[PDB]
Design a protein around this ligand. Structure first.
Ligand code: HEM
Length: 153
């Protein structure tokens, strides 16, 4: 469980993300695919994008990042009371996309990296620790749902 002050730090920097969801999402994916190229293989269409400029030019990939970050933002804003918001993504990622927990760690690391690169003044040690706690909680609850649905990845 996060403190009220930790949630405020999470939501303060998430308001900064919302000034450019699309660009944050692009940077997160580029970082994710570069640091962990195996994650690109889960995207049938995007895995054929060969350079960083091709990635930024893909409207499909840009729209996908907004879709992902909008769902994450809606989970974060429930400050842990997020079962109704989290369950549908747990379902699709367990039964259709098959995204292992390790890959959710990889993208959490990319989120942390991008937030620090774009928002250092709003992402000091305390802020980073709170965002890390919130993404850990997301992954913990995603993992429990994965199991309930029979997905051990
Ligand atoms: C913060 C973590 C993530 C969130 C919040 C998130 C959320 C979403 C949402 C809302 C969708 C669209 C609806 C759905 O199909 O469920 C989606 C689709 C998808 N996600 Fe995720 N996702 C995350 C991480 C990942 C990761 C790490 C991968 C792969 C490495 C991945 C692969 C996909 C794929 C393949 C789709 C289907 C896209 C399509 O065919 O258009 N997701 N995700």
């Amino acid at each position: 469980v996060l403190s009220e002050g930790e949630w405020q730090l999470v939501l303060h920097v998430w308001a900064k993300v919302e000034a450019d969801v699309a660009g944050h999402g692009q940077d997160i994916h580029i970082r994710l695919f570069k640091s962990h190229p195996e994650t690109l293989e889960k995207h049938d269409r995007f895995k054929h994008l060969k350079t960083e400029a091709e990635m930024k030019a893909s409207e499909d990939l840009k729209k996908h990042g907004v879709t992902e970050l909008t769902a994450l933002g809606a989970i974060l804003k429930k400050k842990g009371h997020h079962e109704a918001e989290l369950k549908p993504s747990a379902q699709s990622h367990a039964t259709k996309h098959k995204i292992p927990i390790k890959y959710l760690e990889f993208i959490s690391e990319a989120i942390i990296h991008v937030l620090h690169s774009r928002h250092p003044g709003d992402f000091g040690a305390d802020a980073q620790g709170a965002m890390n706690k919130a993404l850990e909680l997301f992954r913990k609850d995603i993992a429990a749902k994965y199991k309930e649905l029979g997905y051990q990845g």
